[PDB]
């Protein structure tokens, strides 16, 4: 078992589940036997640290479309770029 690192998109792997995302300080309350957390669409949302009884939110590390704004080429070759739904940092 390696160390656990937070707030970066990582390849996490707990007892039997793999995934990719951001592990953050949860605040949900697991039942003292509960390990995982599923979302409304049966998708993982939190985990229990198998070496420390604390709970971690999981978030999909950011993705989005990349759109290229442009006046017609025969007007210019200059383009702007929109990264949808991402924060101007992750880019």
């Amino acid at each position: 078992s390696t160390n656990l690192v937070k707030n970066k998109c990582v390849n996490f792997n707990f007892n039997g589940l793999t995934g990719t995302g951001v592990l953050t300080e949860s605040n949900k309350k697991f039942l003292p036997f509960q390990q995982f957390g599923r979302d409304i669409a049966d998708t993982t949302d939190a985990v229990r640290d198998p070496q420390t009884l604390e709970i971690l939110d999981i978030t999909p590390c950011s993705f989005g479309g990349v759109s290229v704004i442009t006046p017609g080429t025969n007007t210019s070759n200059q383009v702007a770029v929109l990264y949808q739904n991402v924060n101007c940092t992750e880019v």
Partner: peptide, 23 residues
């Protein structure tokens, strides 16, 4: 003898936490 198990005997079917949901 026979009696009636009204709304008894429901158990957490698996480890997964869920909240404010119906499953």
């Amino acid at each position: 003898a026979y009696t009636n198990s009204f709304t008894r005997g429901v158990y957490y079917p698996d480890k997964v936490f869920r909240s404010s949901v119906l499953h």
